[PDB]
Design a protein around this ligand. Structure first.
Ligand SMILES: CCCCCCCCCCCCCCCCCC(=O)OC[C@H](COP(=O)(O)OCCN)OC(=O)CCCCCCCCCCCCCCCCC
Ligand SMILES: CCCCCCCCCCCCCCCCCC(=O)OC[C@H](COP(=O)(O)OCCN)OC(=O)CCCCCCCCCCCCCCCCC
Ligand SMILES: CCCCCCCCCCCCCCCCCC(=O)OC[C@H](COP(=O)(O)OCCN)OC(=O)CCCCCCCCCCCCCCCCC
Ligand SMILES: CCCCCCCCCCCCCCCCCC(=O)OC[C@H](COP(=O)(O)OCCN)OC(=O)CCCCCCCCCCCCCCCCC
Ligand SMILES: CCCCCCCCCCCCCCCCCC(=O)OC[C@H](COP(=O)(O)OCCN)OC(=O)CCCCCCCCCCCCCCCCC
Ligand SMILES: CCCCCCCCCCCCCCCCCC(=O)OC[C@H](COP(=O)(O)OCCN)OC(=O)CCCCCCCCCCCCCCCCC
Ligand SMILES: CCCCCCCCCCCCCCCCCC(=O)OC[C@H](COP(=O)(O)OCCN)OC(=O)CCCCCCCCCCCCCCCCC
Ligand SMILES: CCCCCCCCCCCC(=O)OC[C@H](COP(=O)(O)OCC[N+](C)(C)C)OC(=O)CCCCCCCCCCC
Ligand SMILES: CCCCCCCCCCCC(=O)OC[C@H](COP(=O)(O)OCC[N+](C)(C)C)OC(=O)CCCCCCCCCCC
Ligand SMILES: CCCCCCCCCCCC(=O)OC[C@H](COP(=O)(O)OCC[N+](C)(C)C)OC(=O)CCCCCCCCCCC
Ligand SMILES: CCCCCCCCCCCC(=O)OC[C@H](COP(=O)(O)OCC[N+](C)(C)C)OC(=O)CCCCCCCCCCC
Ligand SMILES: CCCCCCCCCCCC(=O)OC[C@H](COP(=O)(O)OCC[N+](C)(C)C)OC(=O)CCCCCCCCCCC
Ligand SMILES: CCCCCCCCCCCC(=O)OC[C@H](COP(=O)(O)OCC[N+](C)(C)C)OC(=O)CCCCCCCCCCC
Lengths: 90, 28, 491, 69, 77, 642
């Protein structure tokens, strides 16, 4: 069937647990791919709004375009190695 | 009148390989 | 199941060919019956063995999960753990598919000793294929260097006039450079007590130690891709090695360097890879530009193709060191697309022309389209694939690799676009001459492409265009495996 | 006329003024072949094509902009 | 086989030389000038461009925060 | 209906390509002509639906690229801009294929010719109908592929072979810049789809917009033969005349114009690039006409006219008048294809098959139908009032003055001179070929006869299009307020009104006076006072004549300097790096080092009591010496090796 993301953070596990570190690595990967899925859906709305609105696309699709331009920098795959090997609070 | 292209050496030395004046065959 | 069957079956195949062909050495002075038609039966058994190896990886492909994170088919054999992921699975299949092609390319153009050649080809294929399924650094090095023993003898026995020069070059350039990679592996086993992929991927080493380990490994990788300035072995080896040796060298052996980056650098030395990327990009960009301009002045047909391979593998190196999915996928697709086009160009240049005229000098060939129209069609078609014309897997690999470089480094990654112009400069200078003007006065009219050579060209062209039009056959498998290599902490 | 060496040079395009003896027979087959799946192109095109300016109502798009706001 | 290629001695001499240029190469002042340009000068130029703009180009979804067209016109007379 | 317009020419390419051996020469030509005609009728049906009824078609075959956020589909969409581009492409392609049936009837290789010609047609349809830039790039590359095979079609001719390579490599230089622009588009916007990218044009950084379109500008110059990458255009005359009639009318030379018109939603938000397009177009209009007045090959003269007219489209794009550029693009494809067709008619009619107008003369009576086609097409080219070139070219020239900027005023004079030079080289071409005293042998004129009806028919059809067509279609593209949202014009850049109301009446007829008045003066000199055109007398005139006849010496400068030094760099790298320092720091250098060292060591192995006793006793000094001296002993030992 449709498997699900085992929501597991690096912050709540012991890396010496081989299976727990594997889940946190998988958990971070699956949440980034969903954000890529969401970004593509938003871009689908932008394309349909642009085609239909014609010369009205500047006003009609303004907030859709603004949201796509905001999500684009970070709604991409970043990997799990960066956050696994770095502690932001230190 | 007719002149050789650029980057054509006026002399060379490659062992026993025959030494000849460069002839641009396009002008034959 | 995979590794155990792939090794046991091929050992039985190796022993079987030795038993049949060496049972009559003892001053029998007989005429045998397997020696007829250039050892046809012994050639056919080895050809069948190569195809069966492709069937073994398929049985494990049917059960492969593209939506699973981690190595699959995890197996223990000879006290070594063997596993496969999306990246490894495609490289294994590429390696095994070229096995039958290497044998068939040398079906009737060897002076003798066909059993030895077939065994060495099947031995080279399995050792390279096993290199993609090992799961530790030491097992990677064992399979990385084990190919040198048969490859050295293959060149020196079946090679061209300068085979002695080429055999020494491959043995010394690759062995000396890989020993520097062994030094880094020994350091890993000393301070961490293991060389397992997963074990070492989780350890962060000091930034100074990561620099020393990176340089040791990169020396072995840079020579084997190859990159400037340690590339001088490849053109000499390609021009003298037999046709099957050139196919495996240009199709698999060079791809082990990219897989070395994927295993030995990205997941374990992640912090230091970001530091080294500008240096990697500079070296690779100059490798691409210099090799393209040098290719213009070449006069040997098989050396021109050898320098063409260096230019495209610089692009593969650029893509794999991009820290994004676009570049990594583009580099992997370009590796597979190159794995078919480059062997095809060696068959056209060093397998069809050479088997008829036995001369690789460019000055003897022109106007071939007058009496070799079928050869000219395949020559022209593969030339446009080699320059990354769209509808070919090369373009999809090249465009994503260039795009991945631009995303990684907008300023210097833009120089990668010179691959589009420079590759067409030297490739279409050679093709425009072979198919141009009157049929050469130095050649006698002979047969056109035969059925065997048509078969080889067709089945190297077909995968290139299927990947070029629908690369999602490959990107679906690579998607989850490639996403693990990215290192970034966005806040 | 000239010598075309047609004994062994038979490219897919013909090689120096090649018209086979049974060209009328083959031409009808190719014309049938060309016409048959030229209709196939038409049947596929009418089913698959769509108007991208009529897929979503303008009222549906106003909600999108506000929700994404 | 049947020697389908008409071997040319001058072609063979020329081709043999092009393969063996390394024998006659001398590390003179002319060779040193080209070695410095190709392996030191040009890599340094790319070396300084790569690290100068390392992480200095955030060009993903880059926005426009400044007008393009002028509001008022001023004649030149 | 949309799949019929796009892929039917591709089926015609396959049939004459692989089944040409089986259906023969005659039926292969006509079946390919059948496939193009199906695209003609399909395009006209779609033209009514799109332009007149505001209906868009889109067929999404399947996904091409699906790498994370980057999603590229094999989709083809037909809108006002796309269906307008198909009108010159498919129509002229059909009338060139039908022309080629009788023109190429003496060629031993006709199945291959019609395979390349139809494959070229399919690529151009792909370029203008793809839904994103990657699909455009697929057509962009295969146009260059098909142009390479068509220019080098007579591959036993050494000139045709090197001309096909020249066209391919310069365009591949443009492709390398086009790829970079697409990579930067993915970097900034994450997409190549027209619907996504064009919605973001206003909100993107100006520098990012400028970088992408500068890359698009370089690619546009190579295909459209603007100044800098125009050298391949006259080498393209080595191909058969039907190739010239197609490539230079509704095809590859216009691909660069389309790329800039497609990008108008982005191109409007970067004035600096538009300024460069204006100047590059203006320079190429002036230079092309000046070269064409002293050119002597009839196809080269027409080819230089093609370059001059494409530069007229570039200046229109520069002032953001995209609608005028598209309209002049459509009209030019009609009367320029006619000029190439009517030039090939004269070349075939003369039994010597000369192409030099200096060997022509007194042809008007013997081939009156060919003269009429050239005459009408030239007048249409010369923008004679009432004709199709008048409704598309006069407005573009006047729009330069309607800009009321510094650059607009400069380029107006460049356009005005090009307009005047257009009349000059048209009259000169007509005089030498038709109205001059006969320069050919007498035997030529008794055999000078018109060609068959298959050659004539497309010329008549294009002749009518060169008379009325511009007047009928003017209101679609040039009408004020006519909705063409595919070509976006920013409200700050609308100049159609001050162009139409503010210009002086002297400038409304100034191009007409100089062309008609100047043309008559030129015609009188040839007929009555030809002694002024013996320019070999004056040394300054000879040098000025030689400079333009050699095309501003650009081809010499390109080959002798840029190409020679480009190949010499590879030679220097080959000599001093690959065969040089990398051998010294490689096999050859280490072999000499090994031989030197091993020769020293071979002298130390000999059976001698005194030798080994001395070495044993010498080693005792390592015990005596303090260990800090080890590196000095190491340096001393290396000295002894020498
Ligand atoms: C007849 C009965 C055969 C012997 C049965 C046996 O138990 O052999 C041992 C092994 C079977 O494997 P097993 O021990 O059960 O567990 C996997 C760990 N190797 O089977 C083996 O160990 C077979 C090993 C011999 C074949 C490999 C020889 C080396 C091949 C070249 C190295 C390739 C990699 C580099
Ligand atoms: C066959 C050929 C194929 C193509 C060959 C390769 C061609 C591409 C090579 C050039 C690389 C692409 C150029 C893109 C750089 C332009 C980006 C840009 O927007 O410029 C400005 C940008 C920073 O933006 P800005 O906001 O203005 O800076 C202030 C920040 N507070 O950044 C800057 O400030 C400017 C950065 C310096 C640009 C140097 C460009 C020269 C590179 C020369 C390479 C060696 C020759
Ligand atoms: C010289 C060598 C000889 C070989 C030369 C020719 C090579 C063969 C050409 C085809 C290349 C193979 C690629 C097609 C294989 C099928 C790919 C596929 O799986 O399509 C699936 C597609 C969407 O998938 P889905 O929605 O999930 O439904 C299916 C679920 N299994 O579902 C679909 O809608 C299927 C649609 C298939 C459409 C036909 C594809 C054939 C190619 C025509 C389009 C090519 C792109 C257009 C390019 C035109 C030029 C710009
Ligand atoms: C050598 C050949 C290699 C053979 C292997 C290649 C196999 C190709 C893949 C097979 C796919 C099977 C197929 O055609 O599926 C039918 C598909 C239905 O899928 P559907 O989801 O309903 O359509 C969605 C489109 N939006 O319907 C389609 O979407 C296909 C329509 C795509 C049309 C694209 C046309 C491309 C050029 C066609 C030229 C050849 C066709 C003309 C045939 C001869 C005409 C004389
Ligand atoms: C890293 C070590 C750097 C060693 C640089 C060696 C420089 C060199 O060998 O230059 C070549 C030179 C031979 O001279 P040549 O190339 O023929 O051209 C000169 C024409 N006047 O060679 C010579 O002049 C002879 C001296 C060779 C010394 C080699 C030292 C090797 C020991 C260190 C190896 C590392
Ligand atoms: C890409 C890398 C570009 C590197 C540019 C190198 C420029 C250069 O080295 O020019 C030197 C070359 C003349 O060098 P050379 O032939 O040795 O002159 C002495 C002959 N007696 O001069 C040339 O070959 C012309 C090079 C100019 C084009 C740059
Ligand atoms: C990118 C690829 C990278 C891979 C390349 C790595 C190798 C780089 C090293 C390059 C240096 C060697 C190449 C140049 C050496 C040429 C030797 C030579 O020509 O002989 C010089 C001289 C003898 O004179 P002769 O040769 O007869 O005539 C002069 C010609 N001008 O006699 C001499 O002066 C030679 C010097 C005497 C020997 C010095 C020995 C020093 C110690 C040995 C060096 C190696 C150390 C290795 C240590 C571990 C060994 C187990
Ligand atoms: C996967 C792991 C496999 C390991 C086993 C290797 C094969 C053993 C062969 C022994 C039998 C033999 O020497 O037989 C000889 C055979 C076949 O020669 P032939 O043409 O019949 O001889 C001629 C007889 N005539 C004249 C009657 C026709 O040559 C082979 O098989 C060659 C394979 C080995 C080459 C590479 C050597 C590398 C050594 C180091 C490896 C890391
Ligand atoms: C978009 C993808 C399009 C695919 C289908 C296009 C049609 C295919 C035509 C095949 C038949 C053909 O042209 O090759 C066969 C013809 C043969 O010459 P001939 O005219 O019979 O004269 C025969 C007289 N000789 C023998 C003197 C030539 O050419 C040649 O060998 C000429 C050499 C150039 C090779 C052209 C290959 C073109 C491939 C296109 C690369 C993308
Ligand atoms: C084919 C052959 C290719 C060879 C490899 C190519 C890669 C070269 C990388 C050059 C990097 C570089 O130039 O980095 C520059 C650095 C330091 O710069 P700085 O100005 O001192 O400090 C920078 C601070 N600023 C900008 C504020 C002034 O220099 C080095 O210490 C380089 C050491 C190794 C080369 C000697
Ligand atoms: C090269 C030789 C050709 C002639 C040189 C023109 C000299 C000049 O002065 O040209 C200056 C021009 C004009 O633009 P501007 O004056 O900067 O801005 C003017 C701004 N308006 C027009 C809105 C008032 O720009 C160029 O040249 C364009 C770039 C070079 C193209 C080649
Ligand atoms: C508006 C442009 C006005 C200038 C055109 C006059 C006609 C013309 O260029 O012709 C006049 C003459 C050549 O005579 P021709 O009739 O062209 O050729 C016949 C010549 N023979 C018979 C010797 C072969 O030109 C020239 O040598 C001038 C240099 C060419 C560039 C024109 C000016 C560049 C600025
Ligand atoms: C560390 C960075 C990566 C480098 C990888 C290793 C490259 C080594 C160089 C290639 C040598 C080669 O291939 O040896 C093969 C060459 C063949 O020479 P030939 O062409 O037949 O000319 C020689 C004959 N003549 C001139 C008469 C025509 O034998 C030699 O010269 C013998 C010297 C061996 C020295 C090997 C030392 C290797 C040390 C490696 C670490 C410094």
């Amino acid at each position: 069937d449709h498997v699900r993301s085992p929501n597991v953070s690096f912050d709540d596990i012991d890396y010496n647990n081989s299976q727990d570190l594997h889940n946190a690595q998988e958990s971070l990967l699956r949440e980034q791919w969903i954000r890529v899925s969401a970004l593509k859906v938003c871009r689908k709305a932008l394309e349909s709004c642009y085609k239909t609105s014609g010369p009205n696309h500047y006003e009609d699709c303004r907030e859709i375009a603004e949201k796509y331009l905001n999500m684009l920098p970070d709604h991409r795959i970043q990997g799990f190695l960066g956050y696994q090997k770095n502690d932001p609070s230190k | 009148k007719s002149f050789l292209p650029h980057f054509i050496p006026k002399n060379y030395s490659y062992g026993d390989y025959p030494r000849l004046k460069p002839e641009n065959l396009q002008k034959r | 199941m995979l590794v155990q069957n792939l090794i046991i079956f091929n050992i039985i195949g190796i022993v079987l060919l030795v038993l049949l062909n060496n049972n009559n050495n003892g001053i029998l002075n007989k005429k045998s019956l397997l020696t007829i038609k250039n050892e046809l039966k012994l050639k056919q058994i080895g050809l069948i063995i190569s195809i069966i190896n492709i069937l073994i990886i398929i049985e494990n492909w049917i059960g492969f999960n593209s939506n699973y994170y981690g190595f699959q088919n995890i197996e223990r054999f000879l006290n070594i753990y063997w596993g496969i992921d999306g990246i490894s699975l495609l490289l294994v299949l590429l390696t095994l598919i070229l096995g039958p092609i290497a044998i068939l390319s040398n079906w009737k153009n060897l002076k003798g000793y066909y059993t030895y050649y077939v065994i060495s080809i099947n031995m080279l294929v399995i050792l390279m294929a096993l290199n993609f399924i090992c799961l530790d650094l030491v097992s990677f090095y064992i399979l990385f260097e084990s190919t040198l023993a048969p490859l050295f003898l293959l060149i020196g026995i079946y090679g061209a006039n300068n085979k002695n020069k080429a055999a020494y070059y491959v043995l010394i350039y690759t062995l000396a450079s890989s020993l520097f990679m062994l030094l880094s592996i020994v350091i890993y086993y000393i301070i961490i007590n293991s060389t397992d992929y997963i074990y070492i991927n989780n350890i962060i080493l000091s930034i100074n130690l990561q620099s020393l380990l990176f340089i040791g490994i990169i020396i072995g990788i840079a020579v084997k891709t190859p990159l400037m300035p340690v590339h001088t072995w490849l053109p000499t080896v390609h021009s003298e090695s037999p046709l099957g040796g050139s196919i495996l060298l240009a199709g698999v052996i060079l791809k082990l360097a990219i897989y070395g980056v994927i295993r030995l650098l990205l997941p374990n030395l992640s912090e230091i890879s970001m530091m080294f990327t500008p240096i990697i990009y500079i070296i690779s960009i100059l490798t691409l530009i210099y090799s393209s301009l040098i290719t213009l002045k070449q006069t040997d047909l098989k050396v021109i193709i050898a320098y063409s391979s260096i230019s495209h593998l610089a692009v593969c190196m650029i893509g794999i060191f991009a820290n994004n999915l676009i570049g990594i996928n583009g580099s992997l697709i370009l590796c597979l697309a190159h794995g078919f086009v480059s062997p095809a160009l060696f068959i056209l240049v060093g397998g069809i022309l050479y088997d008829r005229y036995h001369n690789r000098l460019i000055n003897y060939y022109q106007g071939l389209s007058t009496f070799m129209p079928i050869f000219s069609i395949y020559l022209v078609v593969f030339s446009f694939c080699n320059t990354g014309t769209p509808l070919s897997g090369n373009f999809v690999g090249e465009f994503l690799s260039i795009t991945g470089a631009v995303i990684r480094h907008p300023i210097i990654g833009s120089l990668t676009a010179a691959s589009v112009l420079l590759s067409a400069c030297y490739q279409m200078k050679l093709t425009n001459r072979l198919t141009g003007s009157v049929f050469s006065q130095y050649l006698h009219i002979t047969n056109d492409v035969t059925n065997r050579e048509i078969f080889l060209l067709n089945w190297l062209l077909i995968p290139t265009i299927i990947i070029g039009i629908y690369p999602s056959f490959v990107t679906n498998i690579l998607n989850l495996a490639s996403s693990t290599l990215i290192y970034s902490v966005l806040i | 006329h000239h010598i075309h060496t047609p004994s062994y040079i038979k490219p897919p395009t013909g090689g120096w003024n090649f018209t086979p003896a049974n060209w009328k027979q083959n031409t009808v087959l190719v014309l049938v072949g060309f016409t048959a799946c030229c209709v196939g192109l038409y049947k596929l095109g009418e089913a698959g094509s769509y108007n991208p300016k009529l897929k979503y109502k303008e009222e549906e798009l106003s909600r999108w902009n506000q929700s994404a706001k | 086989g049947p020697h389908l290629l008409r071997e040319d001695a001058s072609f063979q001499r020329y081709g043999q030389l092009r393969d063996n240029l390394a024998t006659y190469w001398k590390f003179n002042r002319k060779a040193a000038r080209n070695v410095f340009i190709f392996l030191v000068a040009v890599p340094a130029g790319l070396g300084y461009l790569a690290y100068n703009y390392e992480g200095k180009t955030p060009f993903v979804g880059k926005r426009r925060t400044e007008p393009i067209f002028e509001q008022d016109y001023v004649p030149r007379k | 209906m949309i799949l019929l317009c796009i892929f039917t020419p591709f089926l015609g390419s396959l049939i004459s390509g692989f089944f040409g051996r089986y259906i023969g020469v005659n039926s292969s030509k006509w079946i390919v002509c059948l496939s193009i005609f199906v695209s003609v009728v399909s395009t006209y049906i779609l033209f009514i639906d799109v332009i007149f009824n505001e209906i868009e078609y889109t067929y999404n075959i399947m996904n091409w690229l699906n790498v994370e956020y980057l999603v590229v589909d094999w989709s083809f969409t037909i809108d006002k801009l796309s269906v307008s581009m198909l009108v010159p492409v498919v129509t002229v392609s059909f009338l060139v294929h039908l022309y080629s049936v009788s023109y190429m009837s003496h060629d031993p290789h006709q199945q291959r010719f019609f395979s390349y010609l139809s494959m070229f047609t399919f690529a151009m349809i792909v370029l203008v109908t793809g839904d994103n830039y990657l699909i455009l790039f697929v057509g962009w590359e295969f146009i260059g592929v098909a142009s390479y095979l068509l220019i080098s079609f007579w591959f036993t001719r050494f000139n045709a072979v090197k001309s096909g390579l020249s066209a391919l490599l310069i365009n591949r230089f443009g492709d390398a810049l086009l790829v970079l622009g697409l990579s930067y588009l993915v970097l900034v916007t994450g997409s190549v789809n027209y619907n996504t990218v064009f919605a973001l044009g206003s909100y993107l950084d100006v520098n990012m917009i400028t970088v992408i379109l500068i890359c698009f500008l370089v690619a546009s110059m190579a295909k459209s033969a603007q100044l800098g990458l125009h050298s391949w255009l006259l080498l393209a005359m080595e191909g058969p005349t039907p190739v010239s009639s197609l490539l230079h009318a509704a095809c590859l030379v216009i691909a660069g114009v389309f790329l800039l018109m497609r990008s108008s939603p982005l191109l409007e938000y970067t004035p600096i690039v538009l300024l460069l397009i204006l100047w590059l177009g203006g320079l190429s209009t002036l230079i092309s006409g000046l070269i064409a007045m002293v050119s002597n090959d009839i196809k080269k003269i027409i080819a230089l006219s093609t370059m001059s007219q494409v530069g007229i489209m570039m200046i229109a794009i520069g002032v953001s008048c995209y609608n005028l550029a598209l309209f002049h693009l459509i009209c030019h494809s009609f009367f320029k294809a006619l000029l190439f067709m009517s030039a090939g008619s004269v070349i075939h009619s003369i039994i010597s098959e000369y192409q030099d107008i200096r060997m022509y003369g007194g042809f008007r009576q013997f081939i009156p139908l060919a003269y009429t086609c050239i005459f009408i097409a030239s007048l249409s080219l010369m923008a004679i009032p009432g004709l199709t070139g008048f409704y598309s070219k006069d407005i573009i020239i006047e729009s330069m003055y309607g800009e009321y900027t510094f650059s607009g005023f400069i380029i107006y004079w460049f356009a005005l001179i090009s307009a005047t030079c257009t009349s000059l080289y048209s009259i000169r071409l007509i005089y030498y070929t038709f109205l001059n005293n006969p320069n050919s042998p007498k035997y030529i004129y008794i055999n000078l006869k018109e060609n068959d009806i298959v050659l004539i028919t497309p010329m008549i059809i294009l002749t009518i299009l060169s008379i009325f067509g511009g007047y009928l279609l003017r209101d679609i593209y040039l009408g004020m307020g006519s909705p063409f949202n595919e070509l976006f014009i920013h409200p700050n850049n609308l100049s159609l009104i001050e162009t139409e109301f503010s210009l002086p009446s002297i400038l409304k007829v100034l191009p007409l006076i100089t062309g008609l008045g100047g043309g008559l003066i030129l015609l009188l000199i040839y007929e009555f006072n030809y002694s002024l055109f013996l320019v070999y007398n004056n040394k300054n005139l000879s040098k000025l004549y030689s400079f333009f006849n050699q095309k501003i010496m650009f081809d010499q400068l390109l080959n002798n300097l840029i190409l020679r030094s480009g190949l010499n760099i590879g030679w220097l790298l080959n000599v001093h790096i690959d065969r040089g320092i990398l051998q010294l720091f490689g096999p050859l250098g280490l072999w000499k080092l090994s031989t030197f060292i091993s020769s020293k060591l071979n002298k130390l192995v000999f059976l001698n009591i005194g030798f080994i006793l001395e070495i044993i006793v010498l080693s005792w000094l390592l015990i005596v010496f303090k260990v800090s001296l080890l590196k000095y002993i190491l340096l001393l030992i290396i000295f002894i090796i020498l």
